[PDB]
Amino acid sequence: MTISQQEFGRTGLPDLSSMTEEEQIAYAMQMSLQGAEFGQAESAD
């Protein structure tokens, strides 16, 4: 296996330098799903 995962790509961030698209789509949903229903505390429009 080759990837490391730890003790290497910790310089600043993951390996988004290769996932780019999938890392921006995967991370995109990440922030878009940081709760459950996008939170409706005071932003239901």
Curated annotation (Swiss-Prot):
Domain of life according to the entry: Eukaryota
Region spans: Essential for ubiquitin-binding: 25-29
All residue ranges annotated as the UIM domain in the record: 20-39
Modified positions (Phosphoserine) in chain numbering: 4
Family: Belongs to the proteasome subunit S5A family.
Comment on protein domains: The 2 UIM motifs are involved in the binding to a multi-ubiquitin chain in a cooperative way.
Function summary: Component of the 26S proteasome, a multiprotein complex involved in the ATP-dependent degradation of ubiquitinated proteins. This complex plays a key role in the maintenance of protein homeostasis by removing misfolded or damaged proteins, which could impair cellular functions, and by removing proteins whose functions are no longer required. Therefore, the proteasome participates in numerous cellular processes, including cell cycle progression, apoptosis, or DNA damage repair.
Subunit structure: Component of the 19S proteasome regulatory particle complex. The 26S proteasome consists of a 20S core particle (CP) and two 19S regulatory subunits (RP). The regulatory particle is made of a lid composed of 9 subunits, a base containing 6 ATPases and few additional components including PSMD4. Interacts with NUB1. Interacts with SQSTM1. Interacts with UBQLN4. Interacts with UBE3A. Interacts with UBQLN1 (via ubiquitin-like domain). Interacts with DDI2.
Protein name: 26S proteasome non-ATPase regulatory subunit 4
Species, as recorded: Homo sapiens
Lineage of producing organism: Eukaryota, Metazoa, Chordata, Craniata, Vertebrata
Residues included from the entire protein: 263 to 307 of 377
